[PDB]
Amino acid sequence: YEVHHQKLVFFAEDVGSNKGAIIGLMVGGVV
Amino acid sequence: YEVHHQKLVFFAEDVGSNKGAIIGLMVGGVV
Amino acid sequence: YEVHHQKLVFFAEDVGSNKGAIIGLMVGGVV
Amino acid sequence: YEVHHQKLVFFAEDVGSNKGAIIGLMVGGVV
Amino acid sequence: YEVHHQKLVFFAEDVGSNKGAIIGLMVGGVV
Amino acid sequence: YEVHHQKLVFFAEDVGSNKGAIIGLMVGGVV
Amino acid sequence: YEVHHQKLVFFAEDVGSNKGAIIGLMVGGVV
Amino acid sequence: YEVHHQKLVFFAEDVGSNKGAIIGLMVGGVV
Amino acid sequence: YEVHHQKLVFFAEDVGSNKGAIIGLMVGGVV
Amino acid sequence: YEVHHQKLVFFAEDVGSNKGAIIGLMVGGVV
């Protein structure tokens, strides 16, 4: 898994109640 | 998995209750 | 898992009650 | 797990009561 | 787990009562 | 407005984020 | 507004973040 | 506003962050 | 505003951070 | 505002940080 040179902007203003995953970036795995 | 040079903008203003996944970027895996 | 040169900005202004994961960046694993 | 050269900014202004994980960055593991 | 050259800024202004984990950075482990 | 002898049962198990009104009973008015 | 003899049961188990009104009973008014 | 003989049961088990009104009973007014 | 003979039971087990009103009973007014 | 003969039970077990009003009973006014 070669992952590089990633300019990332993430906005999540108002979240009532997250019942799961909020991932800005995932290179791998299990969710 | 060669992943590079990614300019990403993500907006999620109001989220009541997320019952799953909110992924800005996923190079691989299981969700 | 080769992960490098990542300029990341993450905003989560108001969160009532998170019942899961809020990950700015995950290189791997289980969530 | 080779993880380097990561310029990261994380904002979480108001959080009522977090019932899970708020991770700025995770190189691996279980959550 | 090779983790280096990480410039990290973390903000958590007001937190009512955290019932979990608030991690600025996790190189590994169990949470 | 004569309203009487009302046996009422109301269930609302999981509500993500209510953006309006959840009224078990309204005898009148404006909503 | 004559309102009487009202046996009422109200359940709201899990609410992420209410952005409005949750009224078990309203005899009148403005909401 | 004649309001009487009201046997009321109200349950609100888990509330992340209420951004409005949770009223068991309102005889009148403005909300 | 005639309000009488009100047997009321109110439960609010866990509340992360209330950003509004939690009223067991309101005979009138402004909220 | 005639308010009488009110048998009231109120439970609020765990409250992280209340940012508003928790009123068992309000006969009137401004909140």
Residue numbers in the entry:
A (entry chain C), B (entry chain A), C (entry chain E), D (entry chain G), E (entry chain I), F (entry chain B), ...: 10 to 40
Give me lines lifted from the publication on this model:
Peptides between 37 and 43 residues in length are generated, with those of 40 (Aβ40) and 42 (Aβ42) residues in length being the most abundant. These Aβ monomers tend to aggregate into insoluble fibrils, the structure of which has been extensively studied in vitro by cryogenic-electron microscopy (cryo-EM) and solid-state nuclear magnetic resonance spectroscopy, revealing a spectrum of different polymorphs. Here, we determined the structures of nine ex vivo Aβ fibrils from six different mouse models by cryogenic-electron microscopy.
For the APP/PS1 mice, we observed only one fibril type made of two identical LS-shaped protofilaments related by a C2 symmetry. The reconstructed density of ARTE10 murine type III shows only weak carboxy-terminal density; accordingly, an atomic model was built from residues G9–V40. The amino-terminal L-turn involves residues Y10–F19 and is mainly stabilized by one hydrophobic cluster composed of Y10, V12, L17, F10, L34 and V36. The S-turn, which involves residues F20–V40/A42, is stabilized by two hydrophobic clusters: in the first half of the S-turn between F20 and K28 involving A21, V24 and I31, and the C-terminal second half of the S-turn involving A30, I32, M35, V40 (and A42). The main chain trace of murine type III fibrils resembles one protofilament A–B pair of human Arctic Aβ-filaments. Although murine type III Aβ fibrils extracted from APP/PS1 and ARTE10 mice show some similarities to the human Arctic Aβ filament, their fold has not yet been observed in the brains of patients with Alzheimer’s disease.
